[PDB]
Amino acid sequence: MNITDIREQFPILHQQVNGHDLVYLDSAATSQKPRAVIETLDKYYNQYNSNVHRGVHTLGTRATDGYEGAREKVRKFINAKSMAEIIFTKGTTTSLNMVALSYARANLKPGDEVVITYMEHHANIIPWQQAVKATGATLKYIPLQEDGTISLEDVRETVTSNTKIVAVSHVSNVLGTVNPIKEMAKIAHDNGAVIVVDGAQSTPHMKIDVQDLDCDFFALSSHKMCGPTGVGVLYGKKALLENMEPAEFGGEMIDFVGLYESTWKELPWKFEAGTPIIAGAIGLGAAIDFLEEIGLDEISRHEHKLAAYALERFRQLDGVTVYGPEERAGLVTFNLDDVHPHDVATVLDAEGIAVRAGHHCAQPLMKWLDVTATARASFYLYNTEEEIDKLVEALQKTKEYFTNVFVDLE
Amino acid sequence: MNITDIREQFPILHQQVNGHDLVYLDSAATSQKPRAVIETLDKYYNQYNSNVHRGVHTLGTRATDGYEGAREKVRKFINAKSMAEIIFTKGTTTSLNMVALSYARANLKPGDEVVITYMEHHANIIPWQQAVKATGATLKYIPLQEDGTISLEDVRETVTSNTKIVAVSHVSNVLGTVNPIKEMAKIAHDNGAVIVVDGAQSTPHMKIDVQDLDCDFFALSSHKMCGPTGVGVLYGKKALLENMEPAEFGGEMIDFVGLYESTWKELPWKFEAGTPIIAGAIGLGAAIDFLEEIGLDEISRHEHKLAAYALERFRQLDGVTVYGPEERAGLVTFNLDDVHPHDVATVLDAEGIAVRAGHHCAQPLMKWLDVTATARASFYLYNTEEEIDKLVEALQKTKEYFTNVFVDLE
Ligand SMILES: Cc1ncc(COP(=O)(O)O)c(CN[C@@H](C)C(=O)O)c1O
Ligand SMILES: Cc1ncc(COP(=O)(O)O)c(CN[C@@H](C)C(=O)O)c1O
């Protein structure tokens, strides 16, 4: 896996920021796109852009072929059984909301439990809050161990026979934890519940097998896996998606429309109201082709390489706290002793290094960590060990600078 | 307004389809993009792609600036008062659904009336069906006159003091009708109702002034107005959007998140859950700049030119029925005597002409017209009179062909 060859595919990497070479370490917020994706979009808008499922003309046929072929590529990419289980959405947040919607609106009664975790992204928290509010059900949290992992026994004790939904992250955008999705799915099925995997931060970096995970729902975002913004995927088990009512209504999802009553389409289009994200989905299919040609397991090996390297180099800096397990997906959330994370991020950007600072849409986890904010650096398949070297050098320089400014206090 | 210069901006137009020069007459399903939009997307993914409202680094700042500047361009483009009234959505269908959602979930009681029309696109029908179902309210239809327009007196008689929502198209995707949105908004306000304008088919072709229309909600789709797929806009009066609850929940729309309770953000982000359609919105802003530089009133003049020309040339063909008024937005929905519309569309595509055939997501209107399906040709700012000449020549040739095949029946 030659990473110079891969980096040469991403034009955005080859620029300077504030006089320094760009060091992008914020892929967990959004990823960059290779020439293959951008040129897929260009070819779409230059040659065969048309609405799909409507006009029965040549450009319409090409666009329909592209969109549904993207659907098939997504099906292959996560080993779903049928394209009917692959629903194009706006992103992971929308997919989780769609499950929260048809569950709440039809399968939640008082006494039923929805169990989540303290590490969940807000997208995997608030929909369940609102659903249990609307239905009178109960919201429960799975506690975390002190290394930021989840114990299977805490799961088994928290999920009871009254649980209808277990909702859990595949990979934590803050701690780097990889959760035991398979065992948790088995435990949820033992208790008669479905399992909803937020796979937003796993899909870009590791192989997904929904058959092996036996997840009932899986949500992913294209903009993290080298794909266009504005598109993502909901996977649901076909049997479940048949019995869920649509979250949106309009064209492309109806069969018969009367003045007062309508019938829906078969899957997947039942859950795709309106003109779909045609270009975005075709570009996501291109992104999938790109990753599969690089190899997902090679990407996993590269990310474990970078994460072990980053962890080892962070322990070489005094006065830095890293949060989460040693076994991780390759992201480092941390803080500097007596330096605010926002300030860290600002000084890193003055060195051309891009990190995130704040709560990372995980306020309960921040409170659990007993911090108000944090800094995070996130790695992907275009990131190098030299970049982590640059990061840790800039962290040392930052701490030296704020010590040589603390001292200058008269 | 030089239209050769404009056509030279659209690379997709300069190709052949099935041996013939492409004649795209299906802009009402989706429009084509000028170099300015595609190159805006390219510049985004090549130079400053990053998530916006999160990382506080330079590329993040550029992307945030682009996204919110697109919001301001949309605000100017439709003369909204505040960016807080401009919400980025997936498209017109989603915006209408969002109004249907927060109205149903909080402002509809039994006895309340939601009034629509027989000409409404399915996107502006089914959400109201489902909302009155969930709330026990009543759904009413405004009848149409025999030329496919709406009489103001039928509106006044159909909307009563128990009406909370009047939902109506600005321009009909089938009949070409331009509805009296302003007078209808006044009548709805007189009865204490809000008015929801489906402006999906008006925004690309004519100037929008939400202040002059006094609409309470306005929905539009980017892919019709030379902009990217997968993005659209909901406009709501700020006072109304403050009191509506969000349709989606997750990051970017919260302020404080507790274990069980959360508070929302201020407008507009209250209604934008998750990573937004960054590239799509920036490209939509580019599309708006493009149209404003061409001039919306020049586009209206051009479309009235093409529609009058098309109507006059259609009356020159015997055995063709055109549906709708003489005063129109420039689209022609029609049928050939003893030729099925799908067949018409197929033969036109063999001549390289792109039209739509079917019900155009307006089944109640099709039944009202007493037809099961129809053919439609739709014009935009890159379409010429020569193309309508080609269309009517191919229609004459089609009818000659099916007469010289009816005769060959032994
Ligand atoms: C008046 C109107 N409203 C709403 C829509 C659909 O909204 P979306 O942008 O989300 O698709 C359309 C699209 N028509 C298309 C479907 C057509 O002409 O066949 C429309 O013409
Ligand atoms: C685990 C997880 N779930 C869900 C989301 C948001 O889904 P969208 O693709 O619709 O944004 C994110 C994005 N995180 C971003 C916000 C971050 O790292 O700050 C995420 O990391």
UniProtKB/Swiss-Prot annotation, chains A, B:
Active-site residue numbers: 361
Enzyme Commission designation: 2.8.1.7
Known regulation of activity: A Cys to Ala mutation in SufU (Cys-41-Ala) has been described to be a competivie inhibitor of SufS activity and a non-competitive inhibitor.
Keywords: Pyridoxal phosphate, Transferase
Cofactor(s), names only, from the UniProt record: pyridoxal 5'-phosphate
Keyword Transferase belongs to the record: yes
Transmembrane stretches, start-end: none
GO BP annotation list: cysteine metabolic process
Gene3D superfamilies with a match to the protein in the record: Aspartate Aminotransferase, domain 1, Type I PLP-dependent aspartate aminotransferase-like (Major domain)
Location of N6-(pyridoxal phosphate)lysine modifications: 224
Pfam families, per database record: Aminotran_5
InterPro entries, per database record: Aminotrans_V_dom, Aminotrans_V_PyrdxlP_BS, Cys_dSase_SufS, Cysteine_dSase, PyrdxlP-dep_Trfase, PyrdxlP-dep_Trfase_major, PyrdxlP-dep_Trfase_small
Catalytic activity: (sulfur carrier)-H + L-cysteine = (sulfur carrier)-SH + L-alanine
Molecular function terms from GO: cysteine desulfurase activity; pyridoxal phosphate binding
Quaternary data: Homodimer. Interacts with SufU; this interaction induces an opening of the active site pocket of SufS. Interacts with frataxin/Fra.
Function (record text): Type II cysteine desulfurase that acts as the initial step in the SUF-like Fe-S cluster assembly pathway. Catalyzes the removal of elemental sulfur atoms from L-cysteine by using the cofactor pyridoxal 5'-phosphate (PLP), resulting in the production of L-alanine and persulfide. Activity is stimulated by SufU, which acts as a sulfurtransferase that receives sulfur from SufS via a zinc-ligand swapping mechanism and transfers it to SufB.
Family the entry assigns: Belongs to the class-V pyridoxal-phosphate-dependent aminotransferase family. Csd subfamily.
Official protein name in the record: Cysteine desulfurase SufS
Organism per entry: Bacillus subtilis (strain 168)
Source species taxonomy: Bacteria, Bacillati, Bacillota, Bacilli, Bacillales
Gene: sufS
